[PDB]
Amino acid sequence: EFKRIVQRIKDFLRNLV
């Protein structure tokens, strides 16, 4: 996704894997 509150890339890989 990278579009669900991940725009800041704060997590990206920490949002699932």
From Swiss-Prot:
Impact noted for substituting residue 3 to Q: Loss of antimicrobial activity against M.luteus
Effect the entry attributes to changing residue 3 to R: No impact on antimicrobial activity against M.luteus
Spans annotated as Active core: 2-14
Transmembrane segments: none
Outcome of substituting residue 12 to A: Loss of antimicrobial activity against M.luteus
Function: Acts synergistically with peptides KS-30 and KR-31, killing bacteria such as S.aureus, E.coli and C.albicans at lower concentrations when present together, and maintains activity at increased salt condition. Does not have the ability to stimulate CXCL8/IL8 release from keratinocytes.
Protein name: Antibacterial peptide KR-20
Lineage, highest ranks first: Eukaryota, Metazoa, Chordata, Craniata, Vertebrata
